[PDB]
Amino acid sequence: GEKISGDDIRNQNVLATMAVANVVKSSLGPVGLDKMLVDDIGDFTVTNDGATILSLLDVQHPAGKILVELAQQQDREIGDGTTSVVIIASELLKRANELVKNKIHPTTIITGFRVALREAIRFINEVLSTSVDTLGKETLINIAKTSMSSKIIGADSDFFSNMVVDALLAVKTQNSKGEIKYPVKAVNVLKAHGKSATESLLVPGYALNCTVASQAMPKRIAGGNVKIACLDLNLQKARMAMGVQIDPEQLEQIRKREAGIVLERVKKIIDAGAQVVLTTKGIDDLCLKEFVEAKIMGVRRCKKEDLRRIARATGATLVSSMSNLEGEETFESSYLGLCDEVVQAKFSDDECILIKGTSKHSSSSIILRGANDYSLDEMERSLHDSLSVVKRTLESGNVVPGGGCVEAALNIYLDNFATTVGSREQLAIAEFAAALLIIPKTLAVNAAKDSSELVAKLRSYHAASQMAKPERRSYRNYGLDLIRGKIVDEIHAGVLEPTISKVKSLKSALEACVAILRIDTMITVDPE
Amino acid sequence: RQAQISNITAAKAVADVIRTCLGPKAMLKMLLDPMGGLVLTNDGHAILREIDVAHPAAKSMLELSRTQDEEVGDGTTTVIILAGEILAQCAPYLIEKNIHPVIIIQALKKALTDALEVIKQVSKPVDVENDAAMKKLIQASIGTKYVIHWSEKMCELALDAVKTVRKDLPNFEIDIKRYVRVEKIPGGDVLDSRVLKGVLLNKDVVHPKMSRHIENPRVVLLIEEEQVQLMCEQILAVRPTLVITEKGVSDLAQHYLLKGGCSVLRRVKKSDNNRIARVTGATIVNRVEDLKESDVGTNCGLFKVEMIGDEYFSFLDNCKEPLEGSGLQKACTIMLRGGSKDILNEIDRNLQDAMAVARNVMLSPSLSPGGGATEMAVSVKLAEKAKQLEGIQQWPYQAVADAMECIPRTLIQNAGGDPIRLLSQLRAKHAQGNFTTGIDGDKGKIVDMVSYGIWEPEVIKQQSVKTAIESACLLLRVDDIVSGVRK
Amino acid sequence: DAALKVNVTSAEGLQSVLETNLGPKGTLKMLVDGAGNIKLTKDGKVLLTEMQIQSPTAVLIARAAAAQDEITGDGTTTVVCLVGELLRQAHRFIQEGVHPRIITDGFEIARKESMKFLDEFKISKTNLSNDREFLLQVARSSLLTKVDADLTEVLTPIVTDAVLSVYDAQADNLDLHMVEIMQMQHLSPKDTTFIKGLVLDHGGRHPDMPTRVKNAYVLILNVSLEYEYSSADQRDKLAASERKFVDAKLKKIIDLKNEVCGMDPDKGFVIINQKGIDPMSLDVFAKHNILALRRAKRRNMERLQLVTGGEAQNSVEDLSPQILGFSGLVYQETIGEEKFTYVTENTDPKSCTILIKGSTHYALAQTKDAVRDGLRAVANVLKDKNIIPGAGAFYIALSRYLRSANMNKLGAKGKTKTGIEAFAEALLVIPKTLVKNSGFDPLDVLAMVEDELDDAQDSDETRYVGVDLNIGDSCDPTIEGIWDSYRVLRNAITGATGIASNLLLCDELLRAGRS
Amino acid sequence: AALKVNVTSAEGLQSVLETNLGPKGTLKMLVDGAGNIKLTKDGKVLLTEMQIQSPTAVLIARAAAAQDEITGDGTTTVVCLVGELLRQAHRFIQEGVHPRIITDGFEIARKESMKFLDEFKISKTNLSNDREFLLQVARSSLLTKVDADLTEVLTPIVTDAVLSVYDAQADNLDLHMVEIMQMQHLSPKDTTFIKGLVLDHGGRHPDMPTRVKNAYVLILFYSSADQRDKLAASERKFVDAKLKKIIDLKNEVCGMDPDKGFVIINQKGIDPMSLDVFAKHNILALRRAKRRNMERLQLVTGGEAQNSVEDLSPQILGFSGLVYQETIGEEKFTYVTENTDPKSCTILIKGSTHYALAQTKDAVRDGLRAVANVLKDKNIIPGAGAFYIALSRYLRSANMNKLGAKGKTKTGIEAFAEALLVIPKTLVKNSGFDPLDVLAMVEDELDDAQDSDETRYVGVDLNIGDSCDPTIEGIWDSYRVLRNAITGATGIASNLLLCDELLRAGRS
């Protein structure tokens, strides 16, 4: 096949990863903007999230797939703020080419980065923020204003700050052998066209979007102890045998006997007492009329994935077929659960059943209304990502100031750390410290400002903090303001990011650059 | 500027396509579809959905017109240009100021709040039940079509529809207009158009001997010789006068059902069976043996015969509902016999939009000057706040005032008047005398909209402009475009 | 507006298509496809069907003829002729700077003023007296616009006597009452003969079928008559049982026929089936003097009820004397492979059957298209008693009132006047086309008409002046007898105004789609 | 069969010059392969080097040849009439009219146009040499070519130039004043007129007289290497014999005191030693001086044009009142002013760039010729399309006055009346106004003038789009302008109308 050796492979790999990296760098920070991708198949999605973009983008050189899998790993760890994460490891490949031209061995480049990140853990612990730390009224609102950054939803921060915080307070459950944590991904987000974000509704529980099949069925159910039954059994004319096949009156009696049993199967649901029943596959008006006389609210054309979270939250047993230990078809009363309050509310020219007070599994749903689908495409993935930051905030109270405070601070620790190790690895620490400073410099590029003027002033304030151990405060200060271009403490601005998000960002970025540095050559076999 | 040119030029040519769709002087444009036919109309809602453009960024704006029609239901007459008009004055920005669009977002938000205050300043209440102003208000939105000849008769059908099939649950007029059926019959005149309480069908009778007429109808919605005969006896057990099935009708069922004195129809779509079930009160029958006495017809006065010179059609006469309220679901229809397919397709678009506009009239009883006077009235205060602002944001903020002046300018170019002296007189008259001064729909004069008789609701002005401004930020928030992704 | 003239120039060539097919002196144009169908006619619906078109604007021209086929069906050439004159005036007045809608708005005013003068120009006639002189003159002008003078003299009493059968005191005219036309190849096309009775299109397929009968009893069937082991003994029983289904019905026919009178089988009896016939039934039909058929139609059976009160039966279960009719005299003619039965001497037939004989297909296609287009045009004359003088007398007379208006109808100065002078001169292309098709000079004839109208108007006398294309001189539509129905001309002017607004209001041509 | 081919194809030729008509019209850029940029409304340049498509444009371009020697301005009426004539063929001739039937109506209308031509003209007195009338005619004449800036400058220049050419018989010849200086200097608005003669050369030596009053104008095998120098010594004596005779002959009047001006002009090169020997007597000589320009010196000082240096007489040397020399660029100019009785003037044009002079060079050549017809023929016709609109109404209603063949000529009469109405509509279309509303107001002014029992001539004001008076505004045309144009208007029309069929063939 085609095999090339030498620097030609590493040069084409860095230039390929840097070209696709500079495309997603325009979304860095609150001033970032979304971009459009042309799939040529008729589908398009406008978003700043690198997890989806790198998955959709066709990777030319096989070395580019390493950064694609890096974005997939961030989803399993954090999943939010991908604009500020995946672009960090992209700058390590640019300065690596100058080190390859030198006599430094590739493993020495790797070893220099290994001791840099291993020691950087203590560097983060010095600027580390405790659980209380700053004012932290609810401690969520201060973080909620940070999640509004990196996205275009920051103009709605007067609302979304209260939306995400007040909704996730009821998600607390006891699982993992007495561990208190929020079951992320169990929150259902709904979208509605028209008006603005101020019309969103907070549901302390599960909310399913659907209506009744027949308009004559009662649409209102009030009171407590509301039982729900999820029935996935398909009600339709039964097919024939294996192909052995078989008086048309006795032949028509097959449908008469089957539909007669189907009516009896619904009568067994009547004796259960559940107020809401669900049906997956569609039915005719014969079986629909029986649901009207059953005095039970039914729903058809149901998605299977929506009913799986119902049986989990409520606790009722999902019944795909009606059977018992005997040959009798019925529905036992032990398959139904209980809920504190269940009511169906009318929202945005539609109605949805609000299931609240789930005893088995507690969760919450957020029903949001917005302009249209294209305007909510960015607002969808952004809110799904913000659920992880709030989780990591109350799971571990460790947070760090954002806006380039960490990258500007780590440079000072590595300046004294470079002279500590010395020998040949001192140059690797200098290149690693300068590579971390590129991210805050590109932050002002998207804002059309001067980054070097701010970095020179910001680093001087972090230096006066480290140079004086005993410290009132005539020196210590931090924070960077993009709008006014000034240095102010982030306690007033309210920008703080969880520590676990930044630690795992640099932890995964270490092995990302090493995977490229370990490639001596690349060979491609022609397909059959 | 590499990816910004593709986004600007995507919606730049769209403005010239729909420029002829505004005002009573609106014209048409011939378009050749890929299917091999032709589409000639002045309505862009069907054009923007069926048009194929090379830049997918413009395809995102093609759905903005559909979103405005689903949420609001108006704007195809005028505001349809406003959706793509905002990007026209945004061109001398990136190539001149070289500033990120984020500044425009703060400029449009301040201009949106000031625009809502100007509309509220000229807002006036009007009685929705009084047919005085509502007669000219309905004709104002539909007066841009070929219906101008019959607009006197076309307004009678739209005025009586909003007071009959709407009702209410209490919240406004809220109801569903999709269940209301409008029958379109080509050929003849609209003088025979009446308000009918029952469903009409275009399918003929399967048997020659069956006579067509009914007094008190019974509607049923559905070896081999004796088996079907026994099936017909089960159908005739309730003695129905009408039999309707979605499938075909065999020749054997024609003779057996003839003994019962009923009419049999074939090739009836499920969309008609859903309306017949509600109007006639019968229940759609799947299994034939399920027919019972609960399927008898209800509130059907008389049955007649309407036949074209070619084939036979089903026609049900008018009736009423004995009272001796529940406006969520209503059963009724409006029969429309059109002269030609050109005007017939326009009336269906007008009648559905007139009921959609009159809906918003009764949702927000407040009323504002229409016909292009409001856009020039806002530009007086919108440009006045720009001089009072005196800041960096003034440039994108004052550029919005041009977008408000270009909306009536499109009507000027379509009418053929001189926009120079006309718009210069409007800006001077609005800032002094009153905001009621506007452009005449024909002569293009300084006559006020109060005496001229054209008005537009406040909700039509507020929601359409607010949606267009928020939708214009779509491409403004797109900093780059990537081609050849190959998902 | 660079693409505005694109659709105007491309659509201009559509006038020469039917230009030669307009008028009583017009000529014929041949259109032949690759399937072997030779269609020679002046009808535009057939010529615009299979002919490939370049400019898409011709599709809207065919849609304008849809309303003309129901109301008129004949003389639809004037629809495209008024558009061709408009297209020549299109780039003329629009180049002056006048907006296209301004000219369109001028047509709406001229159309309303035309309907005001439309009632004064027409002459109300009484259709109750059943005037033969009026019907022969109107039908004569319609036949000359389709076929030649040889078929005109023959079909003139045929069309006149056909419309007199359908009428009542309430002026009820059912177009579906008299429809079926007999298509046969016999002798020459000029030998077409009119029949006031009913004609059957099928006859006996067996030599033993009745040759001549008097009182015929028709038995109508629809459902298909043709019907389709341990030892070989079962194979003989299954094949023998195939004929038991047909023989069971044959035994009922024998007893039910002889029921009324079985002594003398000297009268007629006919069994009519849609599908093939069982050859086993022919043995019973021969000895019982029963006429049988093979592959017979259906819709033709419904005509027995409108004359003799017959009934078309589907299954074999219902047999009643109402199904069996009666006839005064029956003349059976054998032409080709299918014998033909004639039912004459009817008591009071309410529908007349058109018997058309000819040579070949294209010879019959000319007459078949002329009768259907000529009958529906005359049928609409009896519907509305208001009759409009024809021969283009209204188009020239209405222009005289439009050319001089001033303080009467003015409106805007130069905006409406442009549309007034346009529509006034747009109606003068029809008499110029009528003379051009005859081979004479249209201007020298029109100059004599204008001089005649000036002498009649100054003399203060009511007169209608037409154009005689035979001698190339002026005439009177009342003297010559050329007339037109009210709904024909009213919907023609209104229909021409609606189709004119489609091309004038088109701003630009756009090409969008997937290549 | 092929008659309709030349009618439809040549119809698109009107849009060529359509927008070049009127003082408010626009300009069209024409660049050839040699790099010559000509930007003008003139039709002679646009119809010459421009490539043509339809062969019918050959007769159209050749039709302007008669207009070049007569009018040269407003020649677009030739093309505008042909374009409207071909559109009338799609209307009147499409009805089946023979092409000659409408042709005979135009020939009859040509004689009727000449009868109405003498009634519409206004006679003026050119014997008094009134400048007030000349300032108005030259004003509007320059408005159709250049702007008002060059109009105000060139108005007194052209007016005072034609006054120097005159006699008791009112003899004005364009072949008298011909030479016009073309140079790039200062700005186009700085053009200065000189009542005397202008020379294109001047003193090349610092000792040459800068400013003087009186100026005397003098118009003009060897066996060894040593033997080869004898021929070079004899050839130098040839030019020395010409210079040595000048020193003695210039002593005629005063050779001792070099306090006056001295001039020597030669066609070919001269021995550079002349500058040394003439510096003592302060005699001026020139380098590469023209010839034809020397014939004008006989009309001022009474000198004589001389070829060789052998014959020199005191009659050749004249007496000049004042002589001034200006240094512009690398070529000095000698101005002759304060002349006793100058019989001619020299036009000196100053400009910036080449395209700036192209607009002025076309305006001066067309301006001097248009004023020439004003002094020759005293009859002056009001302009601004007043005759085209009036003549259209005179022939619109005729009936028993002028009819001819009944119905054959009347069809052509209405075509000629509607064809002349395209010119005023073209004037309004180029200005950006509505020609329908402007023409409607012009027709009302003519109806109000005829009903008032007073003879009046109403024009068209393109600025406000209203009616005006060509007499007050100053728009005027010579009688020979419309005399040859209307006579040629029938000839250009009969070319395509009498054209029968054009076949495609030839010798490859």
Numbering used by the authors:
A (entry chain a): 17 to 262, 266 to 490, 494 to 550
B (entry chain g): 18 to 186, 194 to 246, 275 to 376, 430 to 592
C (entry chain z): 16 to 243, 253 to 539
D (entry chain Z): 17 to 236, 252 to 539
Relevant lines from the article:
The TRiC/CCT complex assists in the folding of approximately 10% of cytosolic proteins through an ATP-driven conformational cycle, playing a crucial role in maintaining protein homeostasis. TRiC is an ATP-dependent macromolecular machine that facilitates substrate binding and folding through ATP-driven conformational transitions. It consists of two identical stacked rings, each containing eight paralogous subunits (sharing ~25–40% sequence identity in the same organism) arranged in a specific order. An individual TRiC subunit comprises three domains: an equatorial domain (E domain) that contains the ATP-binding site and forms intra- and inter-ring contacts, an apical domain (A domain) that comprises the interaction sites with target proteins, and an intermediate domain (I domain) that connects the other two domains.
TRiC-ADP-S2, constituting 22.8% of the population, shows an observable conformational change in the A-domain helical protrusion of the CCT3 subunit. We first compared the S1 and S2 states and observed that, in the S2 state, the density of the apical helical protrusion in the CCT3 subunit was absent. Corroborating to this, the CCT3 apical protraction exhibited a significantly larger B-factor compared to the other subunits. These findings collectively suggest greater dynamics in this region. Overall, these dynamic motions of CCT3 appear to initiate the opening of TRiC’s iris. A conformation comparison between the S1 and S2 states reveals a most obvious upward movement in the NSL of CCT3 (up to 5.2 Å in Cα). Indeed, the NSL of CCT3 exhibits the highest B-factor in the partially open TRiC-ADP-S2 structure. Notably, in the closed S1 and the opening-initiating S2 states, the N-terminus of CCT4 bents and extends towards the outside of the ring, potentially forming contacts with the E-domains of CCT5’ and CCT2’ from the opposing ring.
